[model samples]
Target: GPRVTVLVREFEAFDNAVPELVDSFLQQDPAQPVVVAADTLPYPPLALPRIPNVRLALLQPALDRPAAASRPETYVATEFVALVPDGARAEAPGLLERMVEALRAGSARLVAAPVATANPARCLALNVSLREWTARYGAAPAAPRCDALDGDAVVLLRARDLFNLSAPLARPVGTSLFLQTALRGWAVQLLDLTFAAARQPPLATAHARWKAEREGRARRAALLRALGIRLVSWEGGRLEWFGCNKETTRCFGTVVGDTPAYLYEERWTPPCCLRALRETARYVVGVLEAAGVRYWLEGGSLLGAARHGDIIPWDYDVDLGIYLEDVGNCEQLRGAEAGSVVDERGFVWEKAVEGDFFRVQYSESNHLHVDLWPFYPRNGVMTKDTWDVEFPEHFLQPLVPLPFAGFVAQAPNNYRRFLELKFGPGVIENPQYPNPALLSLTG
Candidate 1:
């Protein structure tokens, strides 16, 4: 018995394209039910061929406001769903069977056939390696596997796994499905097959402006934020935030909103953020070096140094470790009160309310600051007041130097051991980013 239900979603307005799409699916060999679901549709429903297994359902509006989007996962009464876009046609009659076979073998979670990207279909061509596709579809080393998803391509995926990627965002549902699964740990299997894409003619300059604004400013920006991407580096080679504006020319993306995650909340971007942080770290390093006070990279900053000798891509500030008693040697910090004290440079040294540590605020305008966590020895562990993590006191016996944002900084002698203790096993293999869900949690 056929366990696949082909789902065709009319993301693009259902003009003649979608009505014609149903006609194509009706011709597939082993006919399976094709459920076409989208809340936004053109009324006076367009005519179609006498189709037996086609269902056009008016899904409930998803958002509060009026918008055109499709949710194919609303109905999940099948083992696998062969997802097809409204204008997308299954060019090869055998494509669905190949995808179903891949899913049945349990080799890949989400299996999809390539779209007529090169010649006629602008669908899967750009995402999949065309050279490899043309080379030959044989053997393990040459197997087709990629993480990109074309909205117009036909895909057969596990029915329930779609829920794993169901999140409220500006990105299209199919796009989110492909990228999230890979980012979250699964890869898509690309089959050697083709399909015809439903597409409009070349975008007009007027429409492109609005389209670019919608995607660059909102959609891709959100994705960049989620992935902790450094815009300047990702697009340009420069890692330092070069004021990323009209004044400079070195590093900016195709569109202005292709800016850094920092720009979303801050005018001060990463390269500049790192530069400012480097200044603070250098100052603190100098102040402590002269006073004979010892400090080492701690928290995410430590992880940053170990991973790539710099701050984490999403890290907002620097973090360092120093003994509570070491403050006596550094005169600038010796007379620290229970409250805040701003220096001549506008840098403020404030005592932490909950911990034995102190914080050095860069300035009032820029909230960029450093956490000076003070660790103390107790019960065979080096415990800190700010966090519950405890590492062996000997881990800090002799701090060694590690390169940090182009400057060498001190770290635990057995840095890996301390990091493992602080973050748990496989600290290097696993990467953590600022939780995107934090926005929903806070006001």
Candidate 2:
């Protein structure tokens, strides 16, 4: 289940331009959802063809430009959504299907195709026959990676990932969004196939000269730093986003393309594990509340809740944190003389000694456990069992509710900043799985 919504950027006055644009898309995949964003035409809603998968939406007050570059906040939610510029026609059969195949292959959050001119005259300049033109000029490199966006090309992106980008961007949303995607460790791909052809040719245009503009160059460069991106100049007077250099920076062991529903469940919980965690969570919360002990989620569990809105599919354990002084209160729960305590729910709270804080784990089995780390606050640094870190006291205050395994859990106020400190940069940008190379509690 991958769902893709096509957002058509404009509707020109050409003979049947709107209908032709929609017809071509429907011809390829009638089931794929479509949204027509027409600001120039005043055509009534009923004038457009009625179809379950297609919807007509008018951009009121009109846009200064028809390009998808200036619009990013339009769509709300979908698994995947594509931006198709007006006058761009999908003539090649099964082009949409090919793009879907490529997306299901790996970690690419944005998938696009090479653009060719629809004008027969320009097709002649392409030197090869129309059928061969894509192979010659439109075919992406063996790597199928692009540093900048081709204005006329069709761009497909994950809706959840797409909304993570900065909206109301300047011209060429391609560079801004692509760099953001790459910096966060997601993949961007340019298919070597022709997904669509632009009626208005873009080869001869100064499309790649974004950083060349005198007034805009300095402003854009400053903004790049704010967005955590660095720009580099390349041959042919083009600017490209800096690559991460590795194949991808995403977490290891990710299950790309059609993640089974069972595995997609919270923590990829199975029938056996789900009941174990639920009972343990309820029992632990009850005990800690009775003792007046305060704690919040930490480690991978915190990252999963703050960024993903739930427990990560691959995370193996739950992590919680408390102040160093509160360790005594927790110990009293198991009886001061005892090393461990078993709750009525068949859960055991075993104390594990680690430097700098009290380490305790609540477990039904060695395979499933919740790690509790005690933190001590100092003048300029906070001391945890592992390392000394800096953060404001307010970050621990105003605890927020986090959804964990069908129950609401508490998390730090500055949860996002906490993840950045632990995971380094791109924690929010990259989607990690069960791979310990990307993230692990032991590390």
* Candidate No. with top TM-score: 1
lDDT of model number 2: 0.53
lDDT of 2 by residue, 1-443 (tens): 22677776523332224555677777777666777654445444326567766765544455464654335445434567777655477787767667767887856676777556442111100011111111112223434564335345677776766766654233234445545554455555667766555454322335423323443455555654344333343332243332121132211122444342223321233322333444455566566767767878777778877776655644445677776666567544435226566555445566565443332233433334566666777764456647535455567867888776667788888777777888787787798544333233333
Model 2's TM-score against the true structure:
0.36
Q: Write model 1 residue lDDT over 6-35, tens digit each, in one string.
A: 775534341336655666666664356677
Where does candidate 2 stray beyond 4 Å?
Answer: 10-19, 29-31, 38-47, 50-52, 56-78, 118-142, 168-171, 196-232, 235-443
> Superposing every Cα of model 1 onto the true structure, what RMSD results?
11.5
Q: Pairing residues by index, what is the TM-score of model 1? A: 0.51
- Error at 78, model 2, angstroms: 4.2
- All models: lDDT? 0.60, 0.53
User: How far off is residue 54 in model 1, in Å?
Assistant: 3.5
Q: Which candidate leads the pack in lDDT?
A: 1
lDDT of 1: 0.60
